[PDB]
From a paper:
RNRs produce all four deoxyribonucleotides and are the only enzymes providing de novo building blocks for DNA replication and repair in all free-living organisms. Class III RNRs, which only function anaerobically, are dimers of an α subunit (NrdD) with a stable radical close to the active site, and binding sites for allosteric nucleotides. Binding of ATP activates RNR, and binding of dATP inhibits it. Here, we present structural, biochemical, and biophysical studies on the ATP-cone-containing NrdD from the human pathogen Prevotella copri, showing that the binding of dATP causes increased flexibility of the C-terminal glycyl radical-bearing domain, as well as a flap-like loop that binds across the top of the active site in the active form.
To investigate whether substrate had any allosteric effect on the conformations of the ATP-cone, flap, and GRD, we determined separate cryo-EM structures of tetrameric and dimeric PcNrdD, from the same grid, in the presence of 0.5 mM dATP and 0.5 mM CTP, achieving a resolution of 2.6 Å from 1,105,348 particles before post-processing for the tetramer and 2.6 Å from 1,132,695 particles for the dimer. Both forms were almost identical to those seen in the presence of dATP alone, and no CTP could be seen bound to the active site.
Residue numbers in the entry:
A (entry chain B): 120 to 305, 310 to 645, 652 to 674
B (entry chain A): 120 to 302, 311 to 645, 652 to 675
Amino acid sequence: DTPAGMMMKFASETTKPFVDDYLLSEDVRDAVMHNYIHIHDKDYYPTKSLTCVQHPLDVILNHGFTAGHGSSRPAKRIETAAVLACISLETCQNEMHGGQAIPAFDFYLAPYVRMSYQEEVKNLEKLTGEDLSNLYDAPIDDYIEKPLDGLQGRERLEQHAINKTVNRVHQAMEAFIHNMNTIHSRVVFSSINYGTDTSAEGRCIMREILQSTYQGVGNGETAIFPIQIWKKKRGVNYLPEDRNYDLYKLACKVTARRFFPNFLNLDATFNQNEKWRADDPERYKWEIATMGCRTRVFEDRWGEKTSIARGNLSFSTINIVKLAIECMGIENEKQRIDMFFAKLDNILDITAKQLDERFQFQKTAMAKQFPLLMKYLWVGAENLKPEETIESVINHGTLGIGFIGLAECLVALIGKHHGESEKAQELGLKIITYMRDRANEFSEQYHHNYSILATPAEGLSGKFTKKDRKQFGVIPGVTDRDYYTNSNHVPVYYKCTALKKAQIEAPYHDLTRGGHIFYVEINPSVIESVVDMMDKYNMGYGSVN
Amino acid sequence: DTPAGMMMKFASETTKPFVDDYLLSEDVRDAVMHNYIHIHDKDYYPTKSLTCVQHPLDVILNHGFTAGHGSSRPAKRIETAAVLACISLETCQNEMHGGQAIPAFDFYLAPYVRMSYQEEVKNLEKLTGEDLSNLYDAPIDDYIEKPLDGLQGRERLEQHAINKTVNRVHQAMEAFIHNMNTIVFSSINYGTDTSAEGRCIMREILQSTYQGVGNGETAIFPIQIWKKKRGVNYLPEDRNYDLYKLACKVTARRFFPNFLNLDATFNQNEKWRADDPERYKWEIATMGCRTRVFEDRWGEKTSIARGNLSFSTINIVKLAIECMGIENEKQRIDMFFAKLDNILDITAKQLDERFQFQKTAMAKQFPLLMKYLWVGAENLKPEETIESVINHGTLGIGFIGLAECLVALIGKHHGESEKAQELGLKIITYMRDRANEFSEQYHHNYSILATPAEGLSGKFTKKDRKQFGVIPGVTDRDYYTNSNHVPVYYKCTALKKAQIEAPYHDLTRGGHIFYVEINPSVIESVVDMMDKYNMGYGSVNH
Ligand SMILES: Nc1ncnc2c1ncn2[C@H]1C[C@H](O)[C@@H](COP(=O)(O)OP(=O)(O)OP(=O)(O)O)O1
Ligand SMILES: Nc1ncnc2c1ncn2[C@H]1C[C@H](O)[C@@H](COP(=O)(O)OP(=O)(O)OP(=O)(O)O)O1
Ligand SMILES: [Mg+2]
Ligand SMILES: [Mg+2]
């Protein structure tokens, strides 16, 4: 009952009705309280804050950041760069409502491990002066630790300069884990992605944080934050011959007891670009990155295909279960199936209209309303004055239309869900491709970017399930198992193996360009099998615990 | 503009009317909107949160903290200890509505300066394997720095390690400054720790607040206070005289740090010494909000694990103006003291009635506060109505606007009159007497306070000008003067200003300050004038 929590609760309670009655449209707000649609993070509407953004740390580290009197200076070393990343994630969280994301953590923090290594290199000569000025440009395969027992030369001290460097970076990453875990406010949902940087700095960063989320906080308590995602790329870390196969095995072993990190698939046929090369200094631009809230921002109709500096403005969830339940009553299956798609066409248009309306509201903004947000992070910054109505900056944005509850939808007209019938598994794929088609059509119409999303249901776990009992109730197999199932998942109350669930739920990921997950409830052998199933049936994102 | 600012503004706007019409009693809610009193931090009433506390870092450093899921192990080095102090300040800021202060800031990090020095004391024998099992207990005078040009023998490992810790204990204070300067009302006081491990925390913080933040820009936070004592740092022969001169020189261009005086009649104890490891408990410490917590009618005289629960300000100007009209001076002077007793009783009743709601609390409503940082902790279950702990708090009755009250019946403020100074040193001693009487009656601790006017500067002056009319020298010269200061619109020297504003400090046991507006010669002279009489707290800035 922390007082800061009460202040946040009061703010939310005094803001949400004002948002509903003063900042929305009648048509959309009619469905926002009719269990058809659910606007996410509604309490932050009057503030022109955006949901999530992938922070480009290059500008905030080469240059500084200014917010009020907070005049900072460019970073110098690892113990300042990691803390600056924490400060940026915290400060931006005060100017945004969703979760903060660091795409290619290794790519961002690679140079400030090399700089710290140089700083240490120019310190070991103070004991015994020597002209070692060639360690600024000495290639190193990786930064490893070992006992300093047995050596009779500068090798005893050349490796020691990394021995303290790896410990310094390890303590920095442990502080990063704790600092993102010491939730004392009325809570920051930071997510980091890594796995595709083939350098000594990147691999040291990726190895000294996976071994720190396995030790645990406190006396051995499993940490809750940050959410960690591993990027799997063919030719990089998947095959045994690949470069980062060992880190993939380490991630599997850590997930075997702490249920982290999650896994992301860059070999998906919808996560590819035409400018990715193994030698590109900035290849991380053309690579999809996600967060713990299952958010994807990759393509751009009016911009270069990238994820950096972009993000999501807002999104909302659609309760297809209500439509499916309302579709009952009629006898023939063809008529009910046809009527289900009619109820899905208008709601997609309503959601796209809501997203465009929030786009209208969020424009005519100020660069000084959210410091450090529309000044160094978003794509359009550095070109418009602190008050000159930033409008050439918000075009490169994305919008989401979410859905939840496929199992109870697949039991409303045929009687069996997609775990006991093959007819059901064919109807399930139809009600997602149509959503994708209508999303593309609405993006052509309203002149923006739209996508289809499988919401995590972390704040929608039971609201729709409980409130559906208004015009009906006690329906066997649907309104008898407490929470609604996940977006497109096989019900937990149905006994199933791993292979069958993987085959059933896989095809729904290419259609969902906003986000998705494959969830399995229980040695890294099991995690390896789950990742193999995820890769084989072209899935993408997957979690096991 | 900022979403975080807008959420806090909405929370304040939705919480203040609820406090006004539901929680507070009608007797003292009548005076809060009548421009007679102002309850500070009215917004954080419904949450059981005390105003300010001095942080006993020893318990949250020797043992960790388990606020929420954040299970933390004990600290090990200066970086970890300083970041943990910052985290503790930030966490308690989410559970208290006032300002966080570190009592004897140099006292609470010296052991982890020593331990950090021990970090490299074995990281330097790694290259040169040697049995150095004595530098853990090697006495040192100060942690000095100098160019490393010329040295041989067993000193490039046993003395450079002592010398390399300068840049480790340093930039830790800089991260502390910037972290407190980046969007927290943090206060640090130091000056009376004679060890090298304590003086290293004092030199590196004055130097870091002189360089400033950014590209040579003056910093705003944290507020820094220097504790001056006879036998420690005042006389030229004293131990920390050089650091006092350095603080004056830094204040000569950055207007920081402030100055606190332990050489006062009201800032003494009977168990203090020069060798007690815990002697800092008997040393008074303050914040930037002028808060004093030293006296305890049912407890030991201490300041460490205590703080203020609530306080409110009075408007003596309204009483003085309502006392006008009559001709004779004696009758109006008597009526002014008549109108001051009832409001003192009302304020004491308010400070007890707010104590009533802060009573019957639960230790789980604010972790790390009523489980680690307070007097009486470690004896109470997470929900079993902690009540044998909140009896060690303090309650404050504040006042401001002495110049306007010194021109309502006499006509000339204490700067331009000698009959006004005599009347000036009568309306505060009465408040002190009545505060002691109400502390005897209501069975709590009460004190008299001089507010910093950081949230009350014009809130009284505007309505005072709009209520009756335009009155020369009273409600026609923009902002009011400070608590008991010489008016700004008057050409006065420093000696006369000190002679006028000196006697009041012994009367106000809650807070007070001496303000001067512009080489460290001027600051040194201001501190000399502070020591010449009984001042306690003072600062000179332009
Ligand atoms: N804990 C912190 N919170 C917020 N900002 C911080 C923190 N620590 C450091 N900073 C920022 C703000 C300062 O303006 C900036 C100083 O730059 P920094 O990365 O420390 O190296 P530098 O270039 O100043 O090197 P040096 O001080 O060694 O010359 O760092
Ligand atoms: N940046 C931070 N923010 C919040 N808490 C932190 C931060 N850094 C460290 N902590 C806290 C939480 C950790 O459990 C605790 C451990 O601190 P520290 O003394 O460095 O570790 P330790 O006692 O485990 O020793 P070591 O890791 O060197 O073996 O400090
Ligand atoms: Mg550790
Ligand atoms: Mg610096």
